[PDB]
Amino acid sequence: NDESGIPIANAKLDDVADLLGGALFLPLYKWMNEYGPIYRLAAGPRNFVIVSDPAIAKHVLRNYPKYAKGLVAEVSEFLFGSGFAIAEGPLWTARRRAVVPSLHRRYLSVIVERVFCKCAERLVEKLQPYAEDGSAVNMEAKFSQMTLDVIGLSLFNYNFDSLTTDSPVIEAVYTALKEAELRSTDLLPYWKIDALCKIVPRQVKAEKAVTLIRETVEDLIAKCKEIVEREGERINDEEYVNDADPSILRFLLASREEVSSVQLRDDLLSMLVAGHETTGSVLTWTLYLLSKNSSALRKAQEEVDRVLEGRNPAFEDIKELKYITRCINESMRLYPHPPVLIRRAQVPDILPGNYKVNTGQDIMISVYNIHRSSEVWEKAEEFLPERFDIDGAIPNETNTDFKFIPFSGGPRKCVGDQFALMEAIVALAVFLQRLNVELVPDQTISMTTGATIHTTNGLYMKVSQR
Numbered sequence: 001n002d003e004s005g006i007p008i009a010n011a012k013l014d015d016v017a018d019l020l021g022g023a024l025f026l027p028l029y030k031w032m033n034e035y036g037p038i039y040r041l042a043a044g045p046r047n048f049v050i051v052s053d054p055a056i057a058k059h060v061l062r063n064y065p066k067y068a069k070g071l072v073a074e075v076s077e078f079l080f081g082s083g084f085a086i087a088e089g090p091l092w093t094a095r096r097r098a099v100v101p102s103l104h105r106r107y108l109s110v111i112v113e114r115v116f117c118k119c120a121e122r123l124v125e126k127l128q129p130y131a132e133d134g135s136a137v138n139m140e141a142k143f144s145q146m147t148l149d150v151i152g153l154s155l156f157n158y159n160f161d162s163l164t165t166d167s168p169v170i171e172a173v174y175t176a177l178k179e180a181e182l183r184s185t186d187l188l189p190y191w192k193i194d195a196l197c198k199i200v201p202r203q204v205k206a207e208k209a210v211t212l213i214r215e216t217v218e219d220l221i222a223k224c225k226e227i228v229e230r231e232g233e234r235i236n237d238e239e240y241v242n243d244a245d246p247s248i249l250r251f252l253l254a255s256r257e258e259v260s261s262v263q264l265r266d267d268l269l270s271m272l273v274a275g276h277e278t279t280g281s282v283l284t285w286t287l288y289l290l291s292k293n294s295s296a297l298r299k300a301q302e303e304v305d306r307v308l309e310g311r312n313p314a315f316e317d318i319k320e321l322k323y324i325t326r327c328i329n330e331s332m333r334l335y336p337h338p339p340v341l342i343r344r345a346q347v348p349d350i351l352p353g354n355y356k357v358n359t360g361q362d363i364m365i366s367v368y369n370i371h372r373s374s375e376v377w378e379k380a381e382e383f384l385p386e387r388f389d390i391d392g393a394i395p396n397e398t399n400t401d402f403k404f405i406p407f408s409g410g411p412r413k414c415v416g417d418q419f420a421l422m423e424a425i426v427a428l429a430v431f432l433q434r435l436n437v438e439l440v441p442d443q444t445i446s447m448t449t450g451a452t453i454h455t456t457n458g459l460y461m462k463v464s465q466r
């Protein structure tokens with residue numbers, strides 16, 4: 001008896017291979033069913049308390065900073081620096097308070113028209129050769145390109161244009177994301193030694209990518225700042241949008257909050273990463289789930305046909321795309337990004353159920369387990385958008401009491417939750433408006449986990465014009 005009350009899972013080498021190899025969800029789910037809503041994984045240097053229970057997850061997520069960001073904030077410092085997605089303390093409090101006002105309703109309304117619809121129409125245009133010749137297209141890569149192009153336009157008013165062609169800065173983005181994922185699974189953090197970073201090929205390539213990304217963002221910031229200062233631009237209304245530059249960067253510069261240039265670069269870089277692959281993966285799995293579930297796809301097309309009659313979605317249309325919203329909600333239930341949330345106890349605490357943890361205890365919340373647990377959800381493995389009241393509030397962690405956790409919760413909740421849901425709704429509505437879609441047969445659509453749940457082998461679809 002270690003007096004904590006927490007059962008200890010018995011992990012074998014095969015389980016550890018899964019934890020390091022992109023199949024993290026597999027042993028964690030198996031151990032949830034064997035040991036219950038909370039258990040310990042102590043594998044070598046690591047010691048995690050793994051939480052698979054709504055009530056405990058709620059306690060952990062709402063009690064920030066008692067449960068602090070922990071290992072995650074430490075492993076991705078190389079990419080984000082002190083950007084507020086991983087910063088803590090008064091810096092975090094101030095930067096989040098400064099950035100959240102940029103995501104207001106008028107800004108969202110402008111972005112829907114000029115960014116979400118524009119990039120989704122561009123996606124459809126890039127699919128026209130496949131619609132004509134009937135061949136298969138990897139929609140997971142296409143959605144990744146679209147959501148990258150969206151986030152860059154929304155943050156900087158700059159189009160990476162990865163839907164059209166590759167570029168050095170685009171390659172650098174994926175190189176940086178890869179490095180962040182590998183660092184979370186390295187057996188030995190050799191990259192802490194600076195001399196090894198100068199000779200190990202993976203590290204000298206990662207360092208070049210991070211430099212190019214940081215330089216690109218710095219140049220974008222300096223160019224916008226020159227305009228803002230020269231023109232004497234300041235925020236004078238509530239819900240401010242510069243009509244010529246409807247970007248978050250412009251809003252933040254116009255607000256004239258005291259912030260260093262590097263902190264602003266780090267802030268925007270953290271939003272670039274936070275808003276790209278997550279949104280692309282949500283759209284990927286939603287499209288997969290609809291292509292497996294003809295009744296849902298039919299109901300989704302019926303809604304977009306009736307609500308829009310072929311028009312582009314406007315901001316005011318989004319609240320009427322109710323079933324399409326619940327399709328995305330149910331996709332995020334079955335496939336949460338990331339599938340686990342990380343915390344670390346900063347003081348001793350007692351979790352609901354009288355489970356005791358000490359200062360320093362690393363915590364893993366398996367959102368995948370909570371969403372797929374038969375103790376939490378009926379028919380947990382089925383794609384049923386109808387499980388949500390189509391006339392009720394859109395489900396989230398507060399109104400389901402953390403049985404559904406699509407955007408985390410508590411003080412560190414995702415700040416782009418309204419933004420991202422609106423991007424998925426608009427892009428999926430435009431897709432379903434313009435294209436029929438079928439899953440190519442004989443594929444194995446399986447999960448590989450990193451910062452998001454992505455497919456192991458791609459998501460190949462056939463499309464045709466509607």
Ligand code: HEM
Nearest residue numbers: 085271274275278279282337407408412414415416419420
């Ligand atoms: C479907 C798309 C998205 C998903 C699934 C998602 C998911 C998440 C999750 C789970 C967290 C919390 C991590 C934690 O508590 O440890 C988070 C934080 C965050 N997200 Fe999102 N996100 C999405 C889109 C976006 C977008 C579009 C933006 C920016 C416009 C964004 C910006 C951020 C930021 C800045 C944070 C850090 C918040 C903080 O620590 O104070 N996300 N995201």
Ligand SMILES: CCCCCCCCS[C@@H]1O[C@H](CO)[C@@H](O)[C@H](O)[C@H]1O
Nearest residue numbers: 019024043044046071072184450451
């Ligand atoms: C010998 C060690 C046994 C395996 C330890 C758990 C490895 C699972 S990867 C997991 O994914 C997160 C987000 O991607 C990272 O941030 C975490 O730090 C990391 O825990």
